[PDB]
Symmetry: C5
């Protein structure tokens, strides 16, 4: 796309506000364990690694239809204000959990692994397959989107194994990451803090704007008047009384500012 | 909805408001033992029977401060409003955590220090021209709050509240009443409030705290406009959990600290 | 104080250099255990919480007299010293690189001695008058009467576990005001700048820096530093770097000294 | 001695690549790719002989740049100058996996141990091979279980510090060992390198990924790496921790790294 | 020194490159255990605290002769690029050490206390004595430089106990620190991260320049055309099979830029 001048004047800006609920594994808001995974199970061996249905976190994603337009004009994403919602819900140590100090102390708070990422773009987020175990069998849940073939080389980067993030709550985070060789029209940001019982470290404010313009002063350009938003926000595990553990995720809010851009 | 006009200049066009808010950890009566702590934490028998005892639940601190009355005639073409420009805020009493002789569990086979207050930290404050707007979100939709009918929670529960369900909202209008565990700032609203928060979890995590009288937080938005104080009210809210006190037998209580605010405001003309 | 212009020209600047030794509880430089507290003891209950003499860290403080400025008091203005900036450092950080002292040790009596570790508390203040204090304690019933030299309120009340503004003081004596129950009063201290940090936990790694290259600006938002009333400069601090763990598990606070180099300038004010 | 930038058509070029990790099992057609073989421990310092495949090595490639004239009799010549790089660790999200066949938490009821522990991350971009200094924790380490590793032919006590007689160039992928070769700070004037180490036993990995960060390769004088012989040299290592097997056996885990490098033509004196 | 203007023209700049090997206790490069301390021992009581020979880290230092000059002209140190060398050597978990998970897991990596300092000056680093134990007896090693008299007050700052860092591998870190009341003509930078088994956190790059100019734009001025460089870099302890522990140190590289300065 050949990018020309900005369109000036009264109707040249618009904003899109949305939230995405977490996709930790039980993703139906009417059913038990919503906002958590099902209980984590552990493979007996690498060739018998078959996660149960609902124990696998997946990416949240939405495509938002933008106001009608129409050299052509496209919406250009300029900036985003994004927040993790419900951080204070983690201030809860009276749930039915394992507890400290010979059954007398606090319940374990949600703790452990944190994974936080978001992406804003003008087309679907482009994905690269990469897994800790090439033999992982996802057949317990046919709604997951994974490659049809398995190969040893996918424990590294094999560029024959790619996808696009086109469906909410379906692409496992454990085997799909952003493709850094593409995504020219998307901006993504992510972080991982691992370990077993690591303290979650989280912030929330309504005062931070993230600029989405690239080094040339150009934001994501919304092809077919679609804005694509994606994320995942794992805040740790809930540890049940018997030691069974579930992923816990939180929703993410977005407020995206867009402007009209003339293109050739 | 408020159309903002020009700043009123000259002398007397600025004012400052100073206050502190004491912590609301659960034992919130300053005349009783255990003030500034929660009651001992208990743990649910099951997720269906999750009923916190009265006073074991931290809540937000909040106040509405009356500002100097600007308008004798409320039917004038324009009016003057107080606009919050900046705030200096600090947690008070951080040095009180340098205490390891209290009646607590202790290190090294009963020969070492008492356990200092440690574990989960949660710090937030908000300054606005109207009450802080809240979104309900909980780790357990079934939590039963009926042991304390002074708490403000939604009148019905549903599975979906373990995520973001925008049908469950509120406004922070009462001190010591809205549980932190189920109410958070609503990011889809709060156009006229600025809020800042952090959480550091884990079981016995070291508290990491700072205090100074030299830091100013700017409250002006992207357009150079601060919170506008509707009806000459300034709304300040916070929560500062610094960890748990571990008693001799392992029983634990939240510990909170007060927060101080020094807010600078200026007169702004607005359309009436 | 109505602050007017800076005084220019020769001798319009001066510097003050000092250090303050730590006041961890054993505060006599001629005695063993200097720079440490006495052994920490622990209350059996909150109504029998009575620290032993010397187990309680207190603030260090000094007043430094500055060159006199105002012989004439009948004129429209006066001159005050204004503290512009300070270079401050904790001294002796390298002394913590010591794992052969008589301490508990790692790995079934084969490994290193425990280094000094655990709680860190670091604060300093520079002002033109004594640091103003607010009382706040983790236990309102703490009985300080084993050491009557500690400056504490004469009465106890439940409300002092939060902020009760009827319980205030000024830091007017070195090695006497417990850090555990006195903090800076944020509603005052207009003429002081203070900076503090706390890192808690049981055996937490101390994280410490030392350099002679950092200047802290003491000017406020209006460009005005602390103004030294009666030509007095007040400097206060506390620097706890953790606990020494003895062989049997007995523990003592360890503190370090703090160095200060303060730049001051002459400022005209209204009389 | 650099002169001015060349201007005009085809005076800019870009190089895009990735490097797969070299943790020890470096064959993409076999099981356990991107991990080391099981770690073993020496009985004593004089019999410290790592097994074949348990030792991470640097990843490296030389990339051909568009060919320029190299006549040694010319007054000036053109060279490619590397200006900036965008680089990211790939597959960080793969660490969100606690159902692998691993030791597990809470009396065999909790999560599998995630990959955790030591992190080592470094990359380099230069106009010649990365210059290496030998330095080891044990001068007597015996590398003879794998003769494909590049190590010095003689061992000496001084190599537990910096002995400048023990140097190399990073000229082969998967060969190299990280444990005994580091970037030489006394050379590498024509390379930029960046590295970090976080140690400990079960330390949480802390990792970030984004496509929004550009690393400037220009030095204090405004000059980037100059590509001798029209070669661009890219090197890295990204260890993200250990996988802990059911019986406590442990393997290094590494991740690939992506690079996008911008270059421009620079006139130099000859 | 009254500082005047910079000298301009050819040969007004020079650079000095060097490295300093660590002085952890076994400081002979021909012997086993070079770059480590001897095994750490622990006093039975504070009045019988007598470290063994070689278990005590000391500062590394050097004086470098600069090109001869000669108002007078002096060399002024402007900036330094400095790096800890051999960080990657800590990626080694097969040494003869204690190991994880019931003798099946990795050897313990070098871990625990980190201490990092360097100084660049135009005269010797000025030191202040301060110790955790005034009674420490250094007589097992007569090559160490320590005060001849012991006193209780030396557990705080006693300004009657000072020295200058004039000998490599002789001044113990545990009782000598930079004197903040002097060192006007030196820049020093240090950090300590303590604890028992703390993860070392270390960086290495050839892209960072440390500016040595003070608030007045003046760097260290090299008296008698001597440049003084000092450091210590403790990266943790090596834990032997039986639990015996030794300090591990790493060398430090310096590239210092100097310029000619006119002085009165
Ligand atoms: C903070 C506090 O109250 N300290 C007490 C201390 C502690 O109660 C105890 O040492 C635990 O660390 O006890 C002190 O008295 C010790 C003394 O107490 C009597 O009750 C008992 O009969 C004696 O045998 C002996 O235990 C102490 O000095 O340690 C007093 C101190 O106030
Ligand atoms: C969170 C919760 O449900 N708390 C309940 C507790 C705990 O189940 C136990 O004390 C175990 O800690 O038991 C009570 O009888 C009590 O102590 O008053 C009722 C209370 O509602
Ligand atoms: C670093 C080292 O020397 N490893 C050696 C190991 C270990 O001593 C044991 O496996 C204990 O882990 O023993 C070997 O027989 C082996 O496993 O093949 C030889 C190998 O050289
Ligand atoms: C710091 C100290 O005083 N070390 C002393 C040690 C220790 O008391 C024990 O070894 C316990 O580690 O005992 C010695 O006999 C020794 O080992 O050579 C003498 C030495 O002076």
């Amino acid at each position: 796309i050949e990018v020309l001048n900005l369109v000036t004047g009264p109707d040249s800006i618009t904003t899109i506000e949305l939230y995405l609920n977490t996709r930790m594994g039980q993703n139906d808001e009417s059913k038990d364990n919503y906002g958590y995974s099902e209980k984590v199970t552990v493979a007996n061996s690498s060739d018998q690694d078959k996660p149960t249905s609902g124990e696998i976190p997946t990416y949240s994603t939405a495509r938002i239809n933008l106001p009608m337009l129409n050299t052509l004009t496209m919406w250009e994403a300029v900036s985003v204000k994004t927040e993790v919602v419900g951080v204070s819900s983690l201030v809860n140590v009276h749930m039915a959990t394992k507890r400290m100090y010979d059954d007398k102390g606090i319940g374990f708070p949600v703790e452990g692994m944190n994974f936080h990422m978001f992406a804003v773009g003008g087309e679907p987020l482009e994905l690269q397959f990469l897994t800790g175990n090439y033999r992982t069998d996802y057949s317990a849940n046919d709604k997951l989107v994974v490659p049809p073939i398995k190969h040893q080389s996918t424990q590294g980067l094999n560029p024959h194994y790619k996808q696009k993030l086109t469906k909410d709550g379906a692409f496992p985070v454990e085997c799909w990451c952003p493709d850094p060789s593409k995504n020219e029209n998307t901006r993504y940001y992510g972080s991982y803090t691992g370990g077993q019982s690591t303290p979650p470290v989280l912030q929330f404010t309504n005062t931070v704007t993230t600029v989405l313009l690239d080094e040339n002063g150009v934001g994501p350009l919304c092809k077919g008047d679609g804005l694509y938003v994606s994320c995942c926000d794992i805040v740790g595990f809930l540890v049940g009384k018997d030691g069974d553990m579930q992923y816990r995720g939180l929703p993410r809010y977005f407020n995206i500012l867009l402007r009209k851009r003339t293109v050739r």
